[PDB]
């Protein structure tokens, strides 16, 4: 049975856009803009986009489209780098362990929004402490913050990551709904997902447009917009902003998960993935910018309502999404409709990205093992059920701490290392000239010198710098006033290293399993598997300087 192809170009484009434009653009990007001075974050973010993220989005799409394999088996062109595919699959699994819990939060809030009196508008609820107060009629004791932290997370019942408690049953039911939706959107291949993304990948844009248009008019929104567009240039001398920008670029665009490779693996050969990558990157960046505009307008609005400064209303984590925006909504007229549309948009943003992240794992491992390829429904069930079981940790009472650890270490330094290894393996060992020849065979034109330079020198160099500084400039993990114990940081670094070490481990395994002399093993490892008949003939390009001097 030959590999099937997307029913339409719109199927592929909507899948790629739904995965790329994700909950990150609304939950992670605006908080990173506030956390890093506002407009100072945008300069590293745009720079990293241009020089690493667009180039590597294009590289992943072209690799998948030409080799027609998943992230793991795509490394038949350079057999030593299959550990990179395994690492990106593992990163995708790690990220889905908590991304679906965020989707479950969105679903819980949506079900809570089916009321004329939103539960986060006032105190007097079973989840409210005796300190609850509405400052617009200290911020942690507001109706919305207390709702999020006690009636949803039940975080008040957890002292820390050492005492996380048992899974919350309402959040467990919402997670069950999310995983069932994912399974039935993924169990029959990419056709069902490509048709499903027609609404999930399009509704968020209308919702976000209305949110932006309304927020820009709210009183005090101008102060938030000014803070958003204010550039603190001394913050660019800190490595934290650059690490955050690079990690956000690769977490939000979707490079380093194996999703783009898996999606392009179902493309027709002549599909223009260059323009697809350009369009998806531009849409992701404009969505991030518009979501940040709306979030900061709401920050200014709430700072005006509270008669406080914008830095006294912003909250770490998913606070800007689940405390600030719900509070502003509750302050509006027709607040029920605003809440319903906001959380439907959040669900639509998260669901297609979870589908893409799970498709990365399913496609990669089914291409790696054909038994899994035949049993698509059973393997999809296995992936979804494993994600559910390991996401149970993030719906516990102290599940926010596990979620913070995961969102810090699953796709932080690890994803940057994975994309760096992708770029190196494709542009140095396989050959940037060979990759350009492949792209010419698909598209008739070779990628411009800008893209080749980014693939071989610029993106690898910036990625290496960001990885090294992220390791060097790591700060102990914290959530609000809670300081994670020293062993939580070691556990998080172990989670990151778990995916990072698959690359050296696979290189060692491939070298040892291969039979022959040292040079024969090296040639087999760096030679494409379909060309392994040349190792005997001793015609390895990588053993000559012209291969390595390809600009």
């Amino acid at each position: 049975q030959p590999r099937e192809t997307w029913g339409k170009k719109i199927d592929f484009l909507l899948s790629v856009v739904g995965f790329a434009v994700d909950l990150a653009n609304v939950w992670r990007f605006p908080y990173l803009c506030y956390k890093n001075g506002g407009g100072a974050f945008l300069i590293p973010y745009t720079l990293f986009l241009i020089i690493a993220g667009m180039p590597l989005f294009y590289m992943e799409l072209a690799l998948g489209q030409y080799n027609r394999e998943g992230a793991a088996t795509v490394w038949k062109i350079c057999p030593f780098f299959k550990g990179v595919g395994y690492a990106v699959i593992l990163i995708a699994l790690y990220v889905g362990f908590y991304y679906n819990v965020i989707i479950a939060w969105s679903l819980y809030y949506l079900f809570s929004s089916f009321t004329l009196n939103l539960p986060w508008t006032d105190c007097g609820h079973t989840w409210n402490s005796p300190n609850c107060t509405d400052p617009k009629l200290k911020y942690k004791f507001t109706p919305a913050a207390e709702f999020y932290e006690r009636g949803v997370l039940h975080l008040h019942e957890s002292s820390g990551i050492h005492d996380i408690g048992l899974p919350q049953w309402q959040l467990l039911l919402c997670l069950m709904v999310v995983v069932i939706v994912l399974y039935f959107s993924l169990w029959k291949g990419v056709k069902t997902s490509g048709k499903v993304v027609w609404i999930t990948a399009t509704l968020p844009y209308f919702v976000l447009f209305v949110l932006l248009v309304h927020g820009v008019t709210l009183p005090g929104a101008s102060n938030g917009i000014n803070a958003y567009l204010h550039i603190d240039f001394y913050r660019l001398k800190e490595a934290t902003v650059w690490i955050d920008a690079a990690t956000q670029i690769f977490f939000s665009l979707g490079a380093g998960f194996g999703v783009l490779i898996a999606f392009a693996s179902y493309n027709k050969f002549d599909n223009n993935c260059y323009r697809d990558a350009l369009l998806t990157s531009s849409i992701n960046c404009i969505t991030s910018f518009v979501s940040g505009f709306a979030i900061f307008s709401i920050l200014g609005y709430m700072a005006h309502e509270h008669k406080v400064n914008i830095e006294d209303v912003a909250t770490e984590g998913a606070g800007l999404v689940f405390i600030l925006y719900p509070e502003a909504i509750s302050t509006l007229s027709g607040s029920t409709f605003w809440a319903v549309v906001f959380f439907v948009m959040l669900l639509a943003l998260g669901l297609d990205s979870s589908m893409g992240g799970m498709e990365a794992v399913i496609t990669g491992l089914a291409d790696d093992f054909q038994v899994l390829k035949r049993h698509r429904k059973l393997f999809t069930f296995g992936v979804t059920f494993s994600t559910f079981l390991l996401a149970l940790f993030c719906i516990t009472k102290g599940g926010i701490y596990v979620l913070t650890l995961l969102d810090t270490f699953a796709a932080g330094t690890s994803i940057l290392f994975a994309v760096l290894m992708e770029a190196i393996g494709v542009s140095w060992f396989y050959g940037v000239d060979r990759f350009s020849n492949d792209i010419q065979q698909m598209m008739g034109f070779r990628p411009g010198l800008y893209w080749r330079l980014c693939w071989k020198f610029v993106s690898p160099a910036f990625l290496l710098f960001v990885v090294v500084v992220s390791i060097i400039n790591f700060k102990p993990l914290t959530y609000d006033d809670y300081i994670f114990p020293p062993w939580a940081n070691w556990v998080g670094w172990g989670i990151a290293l778990s995916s990072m070490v698959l690359v050296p481990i696979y290189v060692i395994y491939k070298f040892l399993s291969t039979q022959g002399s040292l040079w024969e093993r090296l040639a087999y490892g760096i030679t494409p598997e379909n060309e392994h008949h040349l190792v005997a003939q001793r015609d390895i390009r990588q053993f000559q300087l012209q291969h390595w001097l390809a600009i």
């Epitope: 590999r3 192809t5 029913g7 339409k8 027609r68 179902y266 050969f269 002549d270 008739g444």
Partner: nanobody
Framework: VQLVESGGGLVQAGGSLRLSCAAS????????MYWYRQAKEREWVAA???????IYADSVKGRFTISRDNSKNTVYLQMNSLKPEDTAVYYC??????????????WGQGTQVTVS
């Protein structure tokens, strides 16, 4: 899905040769039809793609001309101004039949071309 190549033969340098690729089991007029040659490794020669766009390898551009007949389900490669370096076994390949199809990557048996 089957590809049967023909038209190969011994030709003089600077001559012309028209290879045919009789296709079965799929319509070539929606298909990504590629020509390869193995003198060395199989090197992509030309492609007439799902929407009729013709692309050529730099080694054959301006000399070879790929075309497809919709009535006969045949893909043609008009190789002109042939050189001794064009001597190889030319393979006709169908990457896929476009969108809503399967990635066949089916290859023909090859057709020898010898440029004296």
């Amino acid at each position: 899905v089957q590809l049967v190549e023909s038209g190969g033969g011994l030709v003089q340098a600077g001559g012309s040769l028209r290879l045919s690729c009789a296709a079965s089991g799929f319509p070539v007029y929606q298909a990504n039809m590629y020509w390869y040659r193995q003198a060395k490794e199989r090197e992509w020669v030309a492609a007439i793609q799902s929407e009729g766009r013709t692309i050529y390898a730099d080694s054959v551009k301006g000399r070879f001309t790929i075309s497809r007949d919709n009535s006969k389900n045949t893909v043609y490669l008009q190789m002109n101004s042939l050189k001794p370096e064009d001597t190889a076994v030319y393979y006709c390949n169908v990457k896929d039949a476009g969108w809503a199809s399967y990635q066949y990557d089916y290859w023909g048996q090859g057709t020898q071309v010898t440029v004296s």
